[PDB]
Design goal:
Blueprint: H1 11-14, E1 15-19, H2 27-34, E2 40-45, E3 57-62, H3 65-73, E4 77-79, E5 82-88, H4 92-95
Antiparallel strand pairs: 1-3, 1-5, 2-3, 4-5
This protein binds one RNA strand through residues 1-2, 15, 17-23, 27, 42, 44-47, 54-59, 82, 84-85, 87, 89-92, 94-95, 97.
PDB class: splicing
Keywords: RRM, splicing, RNA
Assembly: dimeric
RNA sequence: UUAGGUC
């Protein structure tokens, strides 16, 4: 994750929420399977605070919204060998967790 | 294994 960029497009709007992925799906496995319908400026999978392996979901931010759109058209998506569900990233203040 | 990596 983390890209040195001044995005005119909202990070949240360019970010895709990837939930229900493989436990083998890490950052490199995630972005590699998503960098196929665009450029990921910010790819990040959540790992367990204890095991440091996986949490079964992650995030992927493209270079622009139209690449997110392309990934959505690519449903059912496939990363690491797992069929996932890529949704528009909501505000973290929205969920407030 | 689905919301936050976010310091």
């Amino acid at each position: 994750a983390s890209k040195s960029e001044s995005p005119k497009e909202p990070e949240q709007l360019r970010k895709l929420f990837i939930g229900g992925l493989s436990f083998e799906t890490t950052d490199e496995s995630l972005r590699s399977h998503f960098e196929q319908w665009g450029t990921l400026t910010d790819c990040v999978v959540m790992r367990d605070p204890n095991t440091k392996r996986s949490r079964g979901f992650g995030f992927v931010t493209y270079a622009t919204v139209e690449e997110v759109d392309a990934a959505m058209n690519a449903r059912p998506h496939k990363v690491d060998g797992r069929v996932v569900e890529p949704k528009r990233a909501v505000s973290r203040e929205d969920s407030q967790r």
